[PDB]
Design a protein around this ligand. Structure first.
Ligand SMILES: N[C@@H](CCC(=O)N[C@@H](CSO)C(=O)NCC(=O)O)C(=O)O
Ligand SMILES: N[C@@H](CCC(=O)N[C@@H](CSO)C(=O)NCC(=O)O)C(=O)O
Lengths: 215, 215
């Protein structure tokens, strides 16, 4: 049979990306939970360069880097549920905004709960600015992908699950500042592929309380 | 129909120059002064305000590797820059990504820092080059018998190696001879040779910058 395996860790927004892609495409796979404090031989063998999850393993061959795995999924299971545009220019723009998520949302978000004072103030400001820029791109559309979820939705909506982390350690009210963004995230969460892939905000928060205290 | 906003010593712009030459695409090159950014640059890449920007019929594509993929997809029936096989494509994207993480920033630290920080940058930089030599293997190019995505992503940084060698006090030629021989093979292709400035030109550009710095 055609074997699909996903090496993952439940609160990771990067893993959630690949979970959504597999679910949206209707692909049967085996989910394997890693302890990143005791990485399995499989993980170390499949992703020697980064030793990170997620890793997608397709008939024994690995694809590391979440957005690269999502693109691999789109290209191999290409006969349903398109996740990227077919127009080259629109595809370039989807790639651009997914890239933007990596560098702004993830990086700045991490500073909100791991930094302090003037630096943490900066990230809070810039983070809200990034959210606002993303709201502008969404505009009045149902999803970033338009009528269906696409590459940018998949890149971005997992970070919503970390919003209580950002809000609580950052003393931010994101819904007050960015209501369009929060309504969009809630729309995504009504889709089975997203609902089943994303942990509850409070579960992520309680997990981060435990790891942050050691920092 | 095709315009490129660029700055001649930027390795990122060099990627797009190689892609355009490989495909035989006629275009207008426009040199930007990044201390006095043009209204067109600010109009076309408002988000990052960086070069390169590819502009196709008035529509901008920013981020060098996204632009290279756009070029591959639109002018798709000659000189493939990426594999058709999805797994091989994912691996090319993986190693291009690795280049994006490592080379520019470590290289920059080599000529702008001092002390232990500088020696740590040197060490990590050579480690990255060696990992890339390993991936190249016995292949002519990263892309196999012709240049591909990873070659395009990486060879521009070779134009900066006299900068790294001189200010870093290291001999990349001795430490990484397989890497340097590969770069010299690339420079024998017309598309690469015409896109890449001489190492000596890049070195003298940086010489005049660096002598003004208090490090
Ligand atoms: N660019 C990559 C990032 C993956 C990542 O950070 N993964 C973490 C998840 S836990 O926070 C990871 O596996 N880290 C390994 C570790 O903490 O040792 C991608 O997009 O897949
Ligand atoms: N991720 C991008 C990086 C482009 C970049 O750094 N561009 C520099 C070139 S000069 O060092 C730039 O335009 N910087 C603008 C500035 O210094 O203001 C890409 O791959 O295209």
């Amino acid at each position: 049979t055609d074997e699909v395996v996903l090496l993952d860790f439940w609160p990771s927004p990067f893993g959630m990306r690949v979970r959504i892609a597999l679910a949206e495409k209707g692909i049967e796979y085996e989910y394997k939970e890693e302890d990143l404090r005791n990485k399995s031989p499989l993980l170390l063998q499949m992703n020697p360069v980064h030793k990170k999850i997620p890793v997608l393993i397709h008939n024994g061959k690995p694809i590391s880097e979440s957005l690269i795995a999502v693109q691999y999924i789109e290209e191999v299971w290409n006969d349903r549920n398109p996740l990227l545009p077919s127009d080259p220019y629109q595809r370039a723009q989807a790639r651009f905004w997914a890239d933007y998520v990596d560098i702004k949302i993830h990086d700045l978000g991490k500073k909100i709960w791991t930094s302090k004072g003037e630096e943490k103030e900066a990230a809070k400001k810039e983070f809200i600015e990034a959210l606002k820029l993303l709201e502008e791109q969404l505009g009045d559309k149902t999803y970033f992908g338009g009528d269906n979820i696409g590459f940018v939705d998949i890149a971005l909506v997992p970070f919503y699950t970390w919003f209580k982390v950002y809000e609580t350690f950052g003393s931010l009210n994101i819904e007050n500042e960015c209501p369009r963004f929060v309504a969009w995230a809630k729309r995504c969460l009504q889709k089975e592929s997203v609902a089943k892939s994303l942990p509850d905000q409070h579960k992520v928060y309680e997990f981060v309380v435990e790891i942050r205290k050691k920092l």
